[PDB]
Amino acid sequence: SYKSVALVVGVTGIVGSSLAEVLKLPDTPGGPWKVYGVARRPCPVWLAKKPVEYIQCDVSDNQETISKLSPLKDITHIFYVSWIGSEDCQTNATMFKNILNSVIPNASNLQHVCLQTGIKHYFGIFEEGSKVVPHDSPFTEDLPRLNVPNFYHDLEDILYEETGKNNLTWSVHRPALVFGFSPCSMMNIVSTLCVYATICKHENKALVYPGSKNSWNCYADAVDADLVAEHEIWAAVDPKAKNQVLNCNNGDVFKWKHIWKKLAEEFGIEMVGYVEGKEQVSLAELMKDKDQVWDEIVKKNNLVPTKLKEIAAFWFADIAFCSENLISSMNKSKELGFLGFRNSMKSFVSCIDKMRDYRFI
Amino acid sequence: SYKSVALVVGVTGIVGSSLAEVLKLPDTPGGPWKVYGVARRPCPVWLAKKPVEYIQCDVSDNQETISKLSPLKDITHIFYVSWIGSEDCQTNATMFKNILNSVIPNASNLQHVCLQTGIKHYFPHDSPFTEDLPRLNVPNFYHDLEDILYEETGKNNLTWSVHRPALVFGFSPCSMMNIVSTLCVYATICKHENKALVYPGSKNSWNCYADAVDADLVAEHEIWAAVDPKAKNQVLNCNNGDVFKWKHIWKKLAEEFGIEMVGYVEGKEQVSLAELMKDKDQVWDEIVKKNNLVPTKLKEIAAFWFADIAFCSENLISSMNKSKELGFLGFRNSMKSFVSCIDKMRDYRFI
């Protein structure tokens, strides 16, 4: 006897993991929820124990998708939180199309399709200057799209078309930089920084900040993976949130300089912050020969064995550390009644804690 | 039959007048509220018709203060939202002391004292400003005010709250100096002279993130701390919960006035708005008459020097996490808060 039935596409992702968890809490709106979890890989060891119906499916394969997803006649809400490789139009588009084409004609009580994109929706060729343009940060919803290839635009168009043709409600969610960790999706800014801190500690080296001066001192924002799930569940159940494009972030701002000090304290090591006259260095380049050291750290500290290149994305930290002026606005969600938030500093530390609890660090 | 009785000290202030209105709203927590409002001037025309018991009292004059407030024995909550000097270490502290000294012995059901200061407490520290930040080594009288608050409440079994509002967006006819009124006056003059809305500030302040607080939200925040046990005995920041940029405020302001704007120009450096409006006093008098406005003198409605400070300010964002983690979920969209303040001045015919 479930009140609502979720199809979570990308259940192995960082947000998809949070959804499967949050949807199954006893107090969750729309509940009690039944949850199907779709991903490409064979059923993970991590999701196996969970009250989630795992479905292994390559959703780029339409025929396989029809076979696996057509029998699911009871679906009421689709949460599409999947993304595969790079930012590629046609591949993500076909996957999204395949999901809808398989479920829509088969789920008679389907109500809502939640589509997750991201703040990269707002990104163009140019950095923001002194002129005033609706595309400036703080990024707000319901601005015109940039005339630039953006695979998020394709996904949105498919969403609007299919839900419009079939009398379904929709919601688009644009999460900021995600703080989170999933054993099936290890790549994240938090895990990357934690691996660096671990390596520094192992080598008896200080936590040396390699990034630019601007990224050290400028305001930044992010979103906790659990908050994204809460936000998507809110839009799935609350009539006020229906047919809305919505940003999703923690509701506050932070500075990498403050995160850095917290990171060093959590690891019990010294830090070197930005040094005047010492320009940005590539963390990816600094870590390029550390794969073997990571394997040694893993065995010495009895960690779940991971390969360095699979748990850390140092290049992505390099991007974050030369980024600026990317704040997104949460006003629309708040004006619509969604009051979820996180303290970003506590959110960062709690992600570290989760990595510890899973013995990845 | 009132549930709580408020003493609002500085009721003609921007936050004070907000407190007067919000406290009397039908569903205000801790209500129904009875409201005493204290200020120096005779009862203003603007608060005359309002359900507020107005008391004229110069709270620096102790004798007058004891005379006027001691009989008010039904007071349950004190909202001290008064400030008088540019920076008077001794005057502001004596004012606050006299209030406490005159009310505490006589109000047997006094529960809580709300002290309002501001983010100037932090600046200097780096931002985002958080409440746990220790005081700077500087004669700040916020420190003095806080110290008086802590011990008088400590000695008398009263709860306390300290509120540090960011830059205030708001308007009061009895306290017209605000960034919003200042910028609207400039826009009005520009429009009158068939000139564009020219931005005089620095590049950084044009492009950087800034934050502010609606005066009505400060009122709600202070009321919340006065009634919610979770909020008791806490230092609390108060801002709108979002960020904005002056560049966007500027364009919005120009659109609202239906005029062209000249934003920051890459080469140019900051010019004094105060110096720009040097000899516009007579021009303002002509605008007032031509547009049938409530008569104000330029030097009374605008504070161009303060806009000049805002327009060379940067890195001043404050955090609202502590209030939110304690259960306060009030917010404002800062852009809409700015426009709402314009509309209010328009409704009162100041512009």
Looking at the structure of chain B, the number of domains it has is 1
B157 DSSP 8-state letter: T
Q: Cα dist. A212→A124, A187, A240, A323, B228 in Å?
A: 21, 22, 42, 9, 44
Please say if B120 is a catalytic residue: yes
Instruction: Note whether A308 and A291 are within 8 A (CB).
Output: yes
Triad A49, A223, A321: Cα angle to 5°: 115
Given CA atoms A107, A108, A114, A115 in this order, what sign does their dihedral have? Answer: positive
Sheet containing A53-56: give its strands across: A53-56, A33-39, A4-9, A77-80, A112-116, A169-175, A244-248
Given CA atoms B340, A239, A176, A132 in this order, what sign does their dihedral have? Answer: negative
Name residues whose C-beta falls within 8 Å of residue B261's C-beta, 6 or more positions apart in sequence. Answer: B196, B197, B198, B199, B250, B251, B253, B254
Given A219, A330, A331, which is nearest B317 (Cβ)? A219
Domain CATH for B97? 3.40.50.720
Q: CA-CA distance, A278 to A54, in Å (whole number)?
A: 50
Residues in A closer than 8 angstroms to B339, CB to CB, are none
Structural domain harbouring B98: 1-351
- Indicate the length of chain B as a whole number: 351
Structure-token pair, residue B49: 């018709």
Q: CA-CA distance, B66 to A173, in Å (whole number)?
A: 59
Name residues whose C-beta falls within 8 Å of residue A22's C-beta, 6 or more positions apart in sequence. Answer: A28, A226, A229, A230, A233
Please list the residues that pair with B176 across neighbouring strands. Answer: none
Q: CA-CA distance, A215 to A280, in Å (whole number)?
A: 10
Resolution of the coordinates, Å? 2.2
Q: Using a CB–CB cutoff of 8 Å, tell me whether B126 touches chain A.
A: yes
Name residues whose C-beta falls within 8 Å of residue B241's C-beta, 6 or more positions apart in sequence. Answer: A251, A334, B320, B324, B330, B331, B332
- Collapsing DSSP to helix, strand or coil, B321 comes out as helix
A41 in a known ligand binding site: yes
SS3 content of chain B, % helix, strand, coil (to 5): 40, 15, 45
- How was this structure determined? It was done by X-ray
B294 DSSP 8-state letter: P
User: Which of A127, A128, A130 to probe the B interface (max B CBs under 10 A)?
Assistant: A130
Instruction: Note whether B331 and B217 are within 8 A (CB).
Output: yes
Rounded to 5 degrees, what are φ and ψ at B4?
-135, 155
Q: How far is CA A40 from the centre of its chain?
A: 18
Q: Which of A241, A116, A228 is nearest to A169 (CA)?
A: A241
Q: CA-CA distance, A9 to A59, in Å (whole number)?
A: 9
Name residues whose C-beta falls within 8 Å of residue A277's C-beta, 6 or more positions apart in sequence. Answer: none
* d(CA B82, nearest CA chain A) in Å: 29
Contacts 24+ apart (CB under 8 A), B271-274: B271/B200, B272/B200, B272/B304, B272/B308, B273/B186, B273/B200, B273/B201, B273/B304, B273/B305, B273/B307, B273/B308, B273/B311, B274/B304, B274/B305, B274/B308
Please list the residues that pair with A246 across neighbouring strands. Answer: A173
Q: Residue B288: enclosing H or E segment and its boundaries?
A: helix B281-290
Please list the residues that pair with B236 across neighbouring strands. Answer: B163
Q: Quick one: residue A183, left, alpha or beta (phi over 0 = left, psi -120 to 50 = alpha)?
A: alpha
Count chain A–chain B contacts defined by CB atoms under 8 A. Answer: 64
Tokens 């509220």 map to which residue? B33
Q: CA-CA distance, B111 to B4, in Å (whole number)?
A: 10
Q: What radius of gyration, in Å, describes the C-alpha atoms of chain B? A: 20
